[PDB]
Amino acid sequence: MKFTPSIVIDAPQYYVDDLQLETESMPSSLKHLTKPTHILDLTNNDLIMIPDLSRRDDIHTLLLGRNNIVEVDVQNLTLSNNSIRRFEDLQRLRRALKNLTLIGNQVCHLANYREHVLRLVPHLETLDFQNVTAE
Amino acid sequence: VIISLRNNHKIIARVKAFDRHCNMVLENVKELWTEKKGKNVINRERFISKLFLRGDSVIVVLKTP
Amino acid sequence: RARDLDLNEIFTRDEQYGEYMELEQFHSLWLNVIKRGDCSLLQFLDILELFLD
Amino acid sequence: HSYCRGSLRSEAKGIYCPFCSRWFKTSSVFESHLVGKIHKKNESKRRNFVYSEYKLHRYLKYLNDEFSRTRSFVERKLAFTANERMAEMDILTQKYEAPAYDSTEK
Amino acid sequence: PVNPKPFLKGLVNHRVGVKLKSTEYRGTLVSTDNYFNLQLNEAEEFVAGVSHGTLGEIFIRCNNVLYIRE
Amino acid sequence: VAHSSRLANLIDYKLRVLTQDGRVYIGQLMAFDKHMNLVLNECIEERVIKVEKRVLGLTILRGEQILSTVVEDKPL
Amino acid sequence: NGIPVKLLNEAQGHIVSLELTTGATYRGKLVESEDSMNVQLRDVIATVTHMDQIFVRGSQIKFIVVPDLLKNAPLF
Amino acid sequence: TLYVSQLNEKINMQRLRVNLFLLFATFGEVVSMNFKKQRGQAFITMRTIDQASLAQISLNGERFFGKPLKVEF
Amino acid sequence: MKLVNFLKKLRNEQVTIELKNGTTVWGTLQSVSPQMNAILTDVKLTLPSDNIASLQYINIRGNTIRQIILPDSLNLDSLLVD
Amino acid sequence: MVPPINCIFNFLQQQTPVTIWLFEQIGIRIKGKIVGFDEFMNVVIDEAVEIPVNSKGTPLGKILLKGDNITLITS
Amino acid sequence: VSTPELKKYMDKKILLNINGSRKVAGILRGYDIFLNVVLDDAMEINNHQLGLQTVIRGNSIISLEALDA
RNA sequence: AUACAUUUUUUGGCACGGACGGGAAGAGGAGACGUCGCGACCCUCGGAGUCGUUCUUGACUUGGUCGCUUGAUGUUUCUUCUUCCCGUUC
């Protein structure tokens, strides 16, 4: 069940509680959404890598709950319950992002995980639903 | 003929069409304005072959013999 | 191999995949260049012909 | 090898130079002019333009058939009526937005 | 007794000046209509009471008009 | 997006909308008008540095203020 | 006749929100509306300042937010 | 719909709702006021009922903005 | 008499359009209303010193459109016939 | 009820000190006596006087001020 | 076509919010289908009254917010 | 299957190695006036609901203050260089 153009065209489309598309092993063929969504819900799928996106200027929210994200190739990124294991794997997020959630990922239990994210991704204001504070 | 316009555009052009609203089809079109972010002084004008025009824009049309 | 190959992204409609070349645009720019309107599309093409010699 | 080497020759005026837009009596004065400060200046400022002009020349020559084809098109469309011009445009459009292979090919 | 339209009619072939939505004008009135669009001869462009240029034969669009005066 | 003739034929499509003040209303066109007034199903006003955002809801939008409309996505 | 007008009329009673050309949002119970969106409203806040019975002329109105219950039925 | 209470009422309303949406999106496709009466509470509505039950069991007492949330049907 | 009619007659033309706010709009006129509401396809919005933004379909309103820049080749007299 | 047209008519009958405000123009006002009446708000007003508003007095002749740019009347 | 139902506001003092960020006050005496207002005079908003009665054009009115309930 | 332009919409009151960007330091961007936010010694403390009539509807009610210890944003007047780091392009 490839993420295909045909798949995207029959997918529930609605205004959420922003314009959101309701959605797989590999993220691909996003061209067909035509950059018309503010949010894309990819929860409960089997994606391994957050990669493969076309240029999408609209896209501001990515809900990627319960997948198998182990590597990273936009204002809000929800990655709860995935497979990121090393602090260094979170490095690509420095190039984006204000709301970040990485809970229920092995990486969470690494020593200094919170401080590492804060220094390497300073643009984040809320991390794991807690305010990044000055101290 | 020359036309003055709401947006500071002196339209020197050849008239083709005319109506109640003073909309105009224009040939041999030569507009005159000034792209200028202050203090600056530039005088610019461009040729256009064929051009439709809307009437609310028109302030005063004039004819130079 | 080339499933996402599309000619319409290379040729405009007025070119008809190499049948014609769209020179109207350049006739416009040309009018802008000569600072008048005495020049018609056909007289412009007549000008271009010079470059065949 | 040719163009910038006095490729344009006249039995009367001699040798023309694309960069200085002047002729020259003999090849001798032509050569000793290609080192002069004038020609250095010009060939150093108007090089890209001269070269582009030349390309326009040779590429337009290679496309003579397309040039003619289009000029023809222009005259045709020009001599159309309203309905005619409209239907023709329709045709160009259809050709543009049509599958490269029809479900009804041999 | 004097309405506006009749006054306007009367004032044909006579000097008038027009302000806009701003620059003053000055010229002899040629003719007028119900919509209050104008056609003038010997038009002089009073840029806030400064005759910048003398255009001559002109046609003023109604909606930009502010007032008429002698 | 499809290649429509008119606005009426593309009813209930998610629409970007520009207005004279510079705001951008986005939402599904429920109903049109003789004077281009628009009913929008789930309307979000987006204003501009960087995009400020406000969710409105069901909105009647006056055509005077409307500049131009663009298609954001397909139905549903 | 305009369906947006109809919608507005229906919204009578309900708490509509309402911005003008000026950009001064109101919220209130919609008392009365006309073909020209000549709205009256009760118990109305004005972006803030509270006020009683505001009248607004549709010419100067920009956009009107109606409650999302009217989406359901039965005008369309 | 699940009813949540014991929420940090210092979060602005629009931020609370957006974090609530984010947090609860993990269980399925998804009302909060700051009045005296309703402050510190929210109703989260899901398309699927199984999603509501899963959310309830898995996020009972989840630390949110500093406090352990209490969830109920 | 009517320029509306003329406008209507102009169909499928790839044209630039100029607004009261100065926005230059390159697109194919698929249709126009009786009240000059332009309906374009294959559209390209550019401002008068900044970057471009392209779009598939745009319905622009009649009150906004200051000047529709017509095509290169056009027989005007013919168009003007009833 | 007293309609606007009726009021205008009354004013005309009277010939009284009328002070007109300009639409979308704060700084300027007009002061004269109503002479004309139209179907629209347009009127002719002889012996008019342009006024710069207090955030003096200026010379002005007989004028018709166009109906679209009127705001206030008083007479 | 339809008359603006301002019979509720008849013979009451109203804040006529008018074009260009200005204001007017005064008791409502009449109106028409174009929403022109005829009112017994009051001040322009510190404050200064002009006129005995006043007539405001339809186009000029932003709002006519009731001072009295 | 065989129709028009003079106040509420559209004839408008509109307009005036090389680049790039961000952040910090050092030398020769700054002042109002507003409008919505990070923290807190503070304040403050908790579509729904009722009834008449009939097997389903009609009426009536309902963050504010202080800092920023270098938060974000329009109007409006006046007058950049060098160094280091991080990202795009060739």
Swiss-Prot record, chain A:
Signal peptide, first to last residue: none
Domain spans labelled LRRCT: 105-135
Origin: domain of life: Eukaryota
LRR repeats: 36-57, 58-73, 74-94
GO MF, any single term: U2 snRNA binding
Example of a GO cellular component annotation carried by this entry: Prp19 complex
Record key words, sorted: Leucine-rich repeat, mRNA processing, mRNA splicing, Nucleus, Repeat, Spliceosome
GO biological process: mRNA splicing, via spliceosome; U2-type prespliceosome assembly
Cell compartments where the protein resides: Nucleus
Similarity annotation: Belongs to the U2 small nuclear ribonucleoprotein A family.
Note: Present with 3630 molecules/cell in log phase SD medium.
Subunit structure: Belongs to the CWC complex (or CEF1-associated complex), a spliceosome sub-complex reminiscent of a late-stage spliceosome composed of the U2, U5 and U6 snRNAs and at least BUD13, BUD31, BRR2, CDC40, CEF1, CLF1, CUS1, CWC2, CWC15, CWC21, CWC22, CWC23, CWC24, CWC25, CWC27, ECM2, HSH155, IST3, ISY1, LEA1, MSL1, NTC20, PRP8, PRP9, PRP11, PRP19, PRP21, PRP22, PRP45, PRP46, SLU7, SMB1, SMD1, SMD2, SMD3, SMX2, SMX3, SNT309, SNU114, SPP2, SYF1, SYF2, RSE1 and YJU2. Interacts with MSL1.
The protein's role, per its UniProt record: Involved in pre-mRNA splicing. Associates to U2 snRNA in a MSL1 dependent manner and is required for normal accumulation of U2 snRNA. Required for the spliceosome assembly and the efficient addition of U2 snRNP onto the pre-mRNA.
Protein's recorded name: U2 small nuclear ribonucleoprotein A'
Swiss-Prot record, chain H:
GO MF: U2 snRNA binding
Any one annotated GO CC term: spliceosomal complex
Signal peptide: none
Keyword set, alphabetical order: mRNA processing, mRNA splicing, Nucleus, Ribonucleoprotein, RNA-binding
Residues in RRM domain copies: 1-73
Compartment list: Nucleus
GO biological process, one term: mRNA splicing, via spliceosome
Additional record remark: Present with 504 molecules/cell in log phase SD medium.
Job of this protein: Involved in pre-mRNA splicing. This protein is associated with snRNP U2. It binds stem loop IV of U2 snRNA.
Record's subunit section: Belongs to the CWC complex (or CEF1-associated complex), a spliceosome sub-complex reminiscent of a late-stage spliceosome composed of the U2, U5 and U6 snRNAs and at least BUD13, BUD31, BRR2, CDC40, CEF1, CLF1, CUS1, CWC2, CWC15, CWC21, CWC22, CWC23, CWC24, CWC25, CWC27, ECM2, HSH155, IST3, ISY1, LEA1, MSL1, NTC20, PRP8, PRP9, PRP11, PRP19, PRP21, PRP22, PRP45, PRP46, SLU7, SMB1, SMD1, SMD2, SMD3, SMX2, SMX3, SNT309, SNU114, SPP2, SYF1, SYF2, RSE1 and YJU2. Interacts with RDS3. Interacts with LEA1.
Name under which the protein is recorded: U2 small nuclear ribonucleoprotein B''
UniProtKB/Swiss-Prot annotation, chain I:
Alphabetized UniProt keyword annotations: Cytoplasm, mRNA processing, mRNA splicing, Nucleus, Ribonucleoprotein, RNA-binding
GO cellular component, one term: commitment complex
Domain of life: Eukaryota
A GO MF label: mRNA binding
Subcellular location: Nucleus; Cytoplasm
Gene Ontology terms describing biological process: 7-methylguanosine cap hypermethylation; mRNA 5'-splice site recognition; mRNA splicing, via spliceosome; spliceosomal complex assembly; spliceosomal snRNP assembly; U2-type prespliceosome assembly
Sm domain: residues covered: 2-74
This protein's domain notes: C-terminal extension may function as a nuclear localization signal (NLS).
Similarity comment text for this entry: Belongs to the snRNP core protein family.
Misc: Present with 2400 molecules/cell in log phase SD medium.
Subunit composition and interactions: Component of the Sm core complex, present in spliceosomal snRNP U1, U2, U4/U6 and U5. The core complex contains SMB1, SMD1, SMD2, SMD3, SME1, SMX3 and SMX2 (Sm proteins B, D1, D2, D3, E, F and G, respectively), and is probably a heptameric ring structure.
Function: lays a role in pre-mRNA splicing as a core component of the spliceosomal U1, U2, U4 and U5 small nuclear ribonucleoproteins (snRNPs), the building blocks of the spliceosome. Also binds telomerase RNA and is required for its accumulation.
Listed name of the protein: Small nuclear ribonucleoprotein Sm D1
Native organism: Saccharomyces cerevisiae (strain ATCC 204508 / S288c) (Baker's yeast)
Lineage: Eukaryota, Fungi, Dikarya, Ascomycota, Saccharomycotina
Swiss-Prot record, chain K:
Entry's Gene Ontology cellular component terms: catalytic step 2 spliceosome; commitment complex; cytoplasm; nucleus; precatalytic spliceosome; SMN-Sm protein complex; spliceosomal complex; spliceosomal tri-snRNP complex
Subcellular locations according to the entry: Nucleus; Cytoplasm
GO BP terms in the entry: 7-methylguanosine cap hypermethylation; mRNA 5'-splice site recognition; mRNA splicing, via spliceosome; spliceosomal complex assembly; spliceosomal snRNP assembly; U2-type prespliceosome assembly
Domain Sm intervals: 1-69
Pfam assignment, any one: LSM
SUPFAM superfamilies cross-referenced by the UniProt entry: Sm-like ribonucleoproteins
Gene Ontology molecular function, alphabetical: RNA binding
Entry keywords, A to Z: Cytoplasm, mRNA processing, mRNA splicing, Nucleus, Ribonucleoprotein, RNA-binding, Spliceosome
Keyword match RNA-binding: yes
Classification via Gene3D superfamilies: 2.30.30.100
Predominant subcellular localization, coarse grouping: nucleus
Taxonomy, superkingdom: Eukaryota
Functional summary from the UniProt entry: Plays a role in pre-mRNA splicing as a core component of the spliceosomal U1, U2, U4 and U5 small nuclear ribonucleoproteins (snRNPs), the building blocks of the spliceosome.
Additional remark text: Present with 1400 molecules/cell in log phase SD medium.
Assembly and oligomerization: Component of the Sm core complex, present in spliceosomal snRNP U1, U2, U4/U6 and U5. The core complex contains SMB1, SMD1, SMD2, SMD3, SME1, SMX3 and SMX2 (Sm proteins B, D1, D2, D3, E, F and G, respectively), and is probably a heptameric ring structure. SMX2 specifically interacts with SME1.
Record-stated family: Belongs to the snRNP Sm proteins family.
Descriptive protein name: Small nuclear ribonucleoprotein G
Organism: Saccharomyces cerevisiae (strain ATCC 204508 / S288c) (Baker's yeast)
Underlying gene: SMX2
